[PDB]
Amino acid sequence: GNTTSSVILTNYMDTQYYGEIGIGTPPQTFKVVFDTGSSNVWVPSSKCSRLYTACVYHKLFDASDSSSYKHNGTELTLRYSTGTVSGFLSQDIITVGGITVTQMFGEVTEMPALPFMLAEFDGVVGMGFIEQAIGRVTPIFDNIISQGVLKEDVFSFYYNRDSQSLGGQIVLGGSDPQHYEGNFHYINLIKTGVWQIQMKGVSVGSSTLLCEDGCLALVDTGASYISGSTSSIEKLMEALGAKKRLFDYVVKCNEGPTLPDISFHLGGKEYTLTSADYVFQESYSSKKLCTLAIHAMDIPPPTGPTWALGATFIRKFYTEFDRRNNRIGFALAR
Numbered sequence: 001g002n003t004t005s006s007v008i009l010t011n012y013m014d015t016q017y018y019g020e021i022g023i024g025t026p027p028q029t030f031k032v033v034f035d036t037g038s039s040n041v042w043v044p045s046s047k048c049s050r051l052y053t054a055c056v057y058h059k060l061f062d063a064s065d066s067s068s069y070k071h072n073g074t075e076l077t078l079r080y081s082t083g084t085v086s087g088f089l090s091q092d093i094i095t096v097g098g099i100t101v102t103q104m105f106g107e108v109t110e111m112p113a114l115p116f117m118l119a120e121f122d123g124v125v126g127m128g129f130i131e132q133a134i135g136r137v138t139p140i141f142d143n144i145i146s147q148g149v150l151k152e153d154v155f156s157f158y159y160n161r162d163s164q165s166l167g168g169q170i171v172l173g174g175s176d177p178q179h180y181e182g183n184f185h186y187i188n189l190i191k192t193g194v195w196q197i198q199m200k201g202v203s204v205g206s207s208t209l210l211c212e213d214g215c216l217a218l219v220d221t222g223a224s225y226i227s228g229s230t231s232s233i234e235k236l237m238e239a240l241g242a243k244k245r246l247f248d249y250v251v252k253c254n255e256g257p258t259l260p261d262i263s264f265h266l267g268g269k270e271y272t273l274t275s276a277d278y279v280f281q282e283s284y285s286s287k288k289l290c291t292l293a294i295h296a297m298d299i300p301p302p303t304g305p306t307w308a309l310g311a312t313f314i315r316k317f318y319t320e321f322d323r324r325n326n327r328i329g330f331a332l333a334r
């Protein structure tokens with residue numbers, strides 16, 4: 001086709017980038033994260049027990065209010081690396097950036113307080129491949145391609161720096177040159193089915209201290225930060241003189257601006273983050289601790305061990321996900 005469509009995103013505190021979808025007739029509106037690390041769409045259900053406080057605090061889909069709803073009812077559990085939801089499958093009409101698609105999605109009835117009480121958004125729209133879809137449900141992007149309206153079988157992400165201001169943007173069917181400069185450089189996927197590419201090395205300061213034999217990088221728009229395996233991150237954090245707290249790593253705030261660059265060697269280009277890119281520079285006090293936008297995440301094989309490049313990375317590098325050519329392109333965001 002000749003359609004390019006955009007989804008405007010809200011940036012909450014540089015950690016949560018989400019947009020709006022409409023489900024049902026008349027539309028029921030949901031805030032959702034668009035997640036290349038997964039392939040299922042789900043929103044909280046009206047059938048969720050209110051003993052789940054996340055369900056008291058989020059928007060709930062009510063099938064009883066939708067004339068276009070089609071019952072299915074198959075049970076669905078979605079295990080993410082950092083949390084789990086469970087519910088049942090349903091079909092309805094979904095509008096996303098002006099495109100309307102008939103979609104099977106999860107109505108979530110079990111929604112843990114962590115992390116969901118902490119989330120500004122209600123649900124998740126997976127932008128991965130069918131290979132990673134739980135219950136073999138056709139992912140939304142596949143459904144949209146089937147309409148033959150998009151100019152290209154690609155989608156792109158722009159995540160802005162926090163703040164009038166656009167929080168971010170997804171382009172379905174292309175890229176937006178207003179939000180990048182220079183040229184795209186592409187890396188082939190290791191294989192169709194996962195948004196994951198080969199990484200040649202990771203250097204901290206100048207020295208490929210890390211990933212010396214090569215490693216994997218999963219480009220994850222549904223993750224706020226950059227992560228590596230526990231052992232890689234242990235090495236990385238030693239180099240930074242960072243202290244491991246419970247869920248994150250910290251540095252004295254005054255030391256923040258002087259931490260070294262971290263570079264990611266992807267397909268022949270070096271992608272360099274400076275300390276301003278990966279430190280949440282709250283104050284510059286030596287009496288305060290500043291959190292790093294780098295975590296440990298251990299993904300079991302076949303997918304892992306893998307690094308994940310989340311919002312920290314994408315904020316600096318506009319990212320295009322090309323399904324036609326099974327590749328990811330990066331360009332310098334603006």
Ligand SMILES: CC(C)CNC(=O)[C@@H](C[C@H](O)[C@@H]1COCc2cccc(c2)[C@@H](c2ccccc2)NC(=O)c2cc(cc(N(C)S(C)(=O)=O)c2)C(=O)N1)C(C)C
Pocket residue numbers: 015016033035036037038039079080081082083115116118119120124132133134218220222223224225226227294295296297299303308310
């Ligand atoms: C069946 C499989 C195909 C499922 N796929 C997966 O599990 C993939 C992870 C998903 O992208 C998942 C989506 O959450 C989507 C989602 C749902 C709810 C909340 C959030 C993200 C949000 C969050 C957490 C806490 C408070 C506020 C927001 N989380 C985050 O920012 C967040 C989310 C994740 C990881 C981190 N890191 C550890 S990180 C950034 O260092 O790499 C941070 C994650 O598992 N993100 C991995 C394979 C990479």
Ligand code: NA
Pocket residue numbers: none
């Ligand atoms: Na708490």
Ligand code: NA
Pocket residue numbers: 247
């Ligand atoms: Na927490």
